[PDB]
DNA sequence: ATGCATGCATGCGCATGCATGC
DNA sequence: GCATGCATGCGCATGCATGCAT
């Protein structure tokens, strides 16, 4: 029996690999496969738009018959690389595709798309440890001593149905030779439906993805990534001699949904580097960014500058005695109701790529820190990350900070101080790093700020957590007619012109790129800066004299 | 409670219903059942198979109590009811004027009636709760005193001593005649 | 047909073929027969519309079949499994006879509906097993898609031949011998080369509203197949037409012994959304078949009259005396504001809905208004005082009924998405419960972060709250803020606050008594159509004059509220005004917001709080 | 004859109700 | 007037022991 379609696909794909001429006249894939000599490389990346310009028939056949054709494409690639270079026969090879011009929602993955080539988007929730997995094992018969090789395991431990010797007909006595077997890398990941695809009154759906070989490396927890692959049924009506199933997604490539100073410089293109250089040589960068991130908000430039300084962050250091010095900055805001207090947190949500936001009692103790659960296919254990861990090296926003329970506040204080989360549960002891920066919003006890009382008497916050915050901002609503007029003008202008009332200088992508580039720098402290800081601190301490009215916060 | 011996607790029995005898018995009813006593498989467990199930001026309410001539027509009108046409009555009094006996008489006279003394039937005693099933093995909702007293008369003694939640539930029953429950695992509207 | 049945295939086929061409109803009106000539046969026109559009599904009413004849209706109800394929093949034959060269994806299927409605599920008997049943209920749980095999693919180990087997009677008999090499037990099943179909499990909560004494609500399980998957959402009130099934239960998975008591089960074949009492849903608003041109012209002519606004306020609730301002506010909430998009700005979601609070003595009809709103508006929810917990709303953790999927389960607020949530006895609610409302009333989103769960949910809900004074009486000596005892942050999020007081007027008492005694002894469909057309067609926009008017109104409100004792004003209140103005723009069917809408919104805001009668410098109201 | 489902503790995570202490 | 300490039900998973259906 012959598989005609598979043979034609093999021929066409080999011809495409051998013949595809690039824009410069050479062949990209020959040079790319020249790097497959290294034992650490097994997958070759092939673009789909280039295939669209070579053979539409082959493209349609591959798209509509991906699962049936893929092993034959792997065999063709193996033959090509074996012909082009001296490689040991034990090595295997795989193909990947990236540029699919269409996307499908998670809820749109019906049973009619089983075995077809699709591209989806999602958010990583959990990852499992790397494992080996069988591909085609070899079985030895215990009766007639006949060796049976190349039996497909699919997705279950399947022994040979019957001995290939007609006289033997053995079906229940076999031995597995692990030495001569065939292995491949295997990892399991969980993904979640994004908020933008949620219908009315619905909870986001969860899906399982499996990564093989090099694709195992990527897809870390907390990311927002696009996956390319197929939909394949895995067992979990009855059969008889003359059935429970579930859906599992196999992915080929994982990409960012919206995409070491020398490495960053090399990665960036010429135009991106030109834009970065243009930004770097502007003093108005200190002012323009304030207008860039908060266009609609009127006034409150101090809060904007504090938020920018918190976003940029400092340089952490370690001492010779074994102690550690904080390098992150935490900011707290307190103000009268409706004084634009919650808008900054939402702006940080929208701007920052790694940000987690919580409010009041909606987050439990297990919601923060982390959790430990079992591995489904081994004796190991896996850790589910909390809000703080997902915001590692990022910004964590907490609204209604006063409503949080005392235990939760103690946990937050521990995370701020030690910058480490220790878990000793279910026979598992572990320590994890949480280098986060906290932006918090709070309200007065009486609902309005008392001008005649100190800061400590106005907020129901414990002294330890109070002392850890670097900057405190206080907002008071002034009963001034001009301020009300100015606020009304901006609100009505925003409502009148939905999108035409914004004149940003730099796009958010450029700001993100510049922040990523700038956070790598580790500036030093000059000698004269030491004396300047000493004198300025002396003046600041002298400000605390008794010859002036009492201040709301001591130094 | 009359047949319970001294210092003991009432015992329970299980009855199976099949055929046209189904849909006759309801919770809270006093019934008489004629049946067969059979075991289930050398110890064994027993059960009952039902064959027959049966249910067990005019202002002369509680003649045992002297006086209160004008306090008895109101009870009769409460029992008769209006044409929502429901009626609610509260009696406030100094101790020793025997308010409890009138409530007990009203409870005994009414066909569907429930009587509450205080915190002994608070919270879960009213409203409803979710419990496992004997047959299906799943969760079902069982109502409280208010649910059982649907289309009947309920009597409450020592009303001022009840908890805030119970008082709010009673107010909701009085004004809206339906109870709304929305907690973890429960989302229901009960008719009372 | 199988033994035990009196159904004849040929007779039923001929009867259905004749019925599809002969049925004409004179009582049918243009109010529901949209785009169909009543003088001509109805189902033939439906088939023609199917041919024009290409939809492979046809809807047939059971009442029409019963009107044509009773034998066919009885046979269809008794034995749907044999009757339905006959109808399908007859329809396919007629369609292919009348319309050659048509292009579709598969043969036309027929879906019956509006069978005799069973009053209560618990009244059913084993005699009704495998019969057509119609139910009315609300969806609370929908599971994920499940694949079910239909064909099986087998491959040989030695010769590798391709064979296919079709499922029969729910069981697949795998061949024990090959077809080319004749080797025994040489065939292996391949799952990925097979064919699968979608299956979904849904949960319904039953509420016929005529329950007997002491009967608790019921929960039913439904199974949907093929395209019917994901046609409903949690919180929707739907009518389900389907079949009744009984399935045995195994004693344990690995032992073939089964329990004698069977398990109830229902298969779904048809869904209906329209209700004779409630307003149109969002599903209907995304279609063009709702309104005939005559009704559109009538509504457009009606909208031109100046008093129609007040007329609508007169037609909202005729069973409650006066309260014109409250009815106008309820109508404006029903119309809603413009749903602008601020994704590019980075500000986030903007609330386009109106929240209303009503404060007054217990002897008031606010509860009647809340009940009427709950019964009238679809996707409506009701809560009362301490009966609801903080975890009861939003979502709570519950395991999947079979495995450990950690399935978050929606609450009352989430089920109220794109709907109305009514709260009674708002005073008794604890601070923990109000913490949820603090985020819900503004951000329209809920953030959940518990063990293994981190997610955000949509909570686009408009809230009607009812409250009472401290002592259940409005003490004239105490101020409004003292009487209310609610935090300023919570009160600031309410667009309209209505203070209900008793003026003790003799004429008012006489009118109330006369109306109450007489209780012993506009068309709703027109109102529904007008509301749906206004809500699904027009997106209002505001001009410079409205801008200046709003600025002046905001500064005047701030000056008025600067005095102590009264409810102070905040910039957020300004936004509320805009929303109200937009609502007025929907009343007059105008795409442009004018100064009249701003003036009306200002008047309503002023009259709602009774600021005119209230003493500006003492906070005491005295009419 | 052998491997597996089930009965019986026990930890885990959670929500809910009753009491009290500032 | 409310958050918290102290039981207690609920739902679940996990580990240790054993008893026999295919
Ligand atoms: N200084 C300001 N500039 C512009 N808009 C403001 C300002 N202050 C308040 N607002 C408007 O008022 C609203 C305040 O709501 P919010 O920020 O949620 O208040 P809070 O955070 O104090 O609860 C926002 O929608 C914002 O548009
Ligand atoms: N008007 C009355 N006529 C006859 N007996 C009475 C009267 N008032 C009180 N009693 C007697 O006094 C006792 C009062 O006890 P109880 O009913 O518990 O009082 P309360 O209901 O007020 O707590 C009863 O046992 C009753 O026999
Ligand atoms: Mg806020
Ligand atoms: Mg008494
Ligand atoms: Zn052999
Ligand atoms: Zn063969």
Numbering used by the authors:
A (entry chain 6): 18 to 253, 262 to 267, 292 to 308, 321 to 616
B (entry chain 7): 241 to 281, 292 to 306, 336 to 362, 372 to 480
C (entry chain 4): 151 to 671, 682 to 783
List sentences quoted exactly from the publication behind this structure:
Eukaryotic DNA replication begins with the loading of the MCM replicative DNA helicase as a head-to-head double hexamer at origins of DNA replication. Our current understanding of how the double hexamer is assembled by the origin recognition complex (ORC), CDC6 and CDT1 comes mostly from budding yeast. Here we characterize human double hexamer (hDH) loading using biochemical reconstitution and cryo-electron microscopy with purified proteins. Although both yeast and humans use the ORC, CDC6 and CDT1 to load an MCM double hexamer around double stranded DNA, our work shows that there are clear differences in how the two organisms accomplish this feat.
Two fully loaded hSH species were identified in both the recruitment (ATPγS) and loading (ATP) datasets. One species is the isolated hSH topologically bound to duplex DNA, which we solved to 3.2 Å resolution from the ATP dataset, yielding a map of sufficient quality to distinguish ADP from ATP within the catalytic centres. Unlike for the OCCM complex, both the N- and the C-terminal tiers are well-resolved and the MCM2–MCM5 gate is completely shut. The DNA grip of the PS1 pore loops matches that observed for the hDH, with MCM7, MCM4 and MCM6 engaging the leading strand template. The path of the double helix is less distorted compared with the hDH structure, which positions L209 too far to contact the double helix and R195 retracted and engaged to a DNA-backbone phosphate. As a result, no DNA untwisting or melting can be observed in the hSH structure. Despite this difference, nucleotide occupancy matches that of the hDH, with one apo site (MCM7–MCM4), one site with ATP bound and all other sites bound to ADP. In comparing the DNA grip of various MCM structures, yDH emerges as an outlier: ySH, hSH and hMO* all grip the DNA in a very similar manner to hDH.
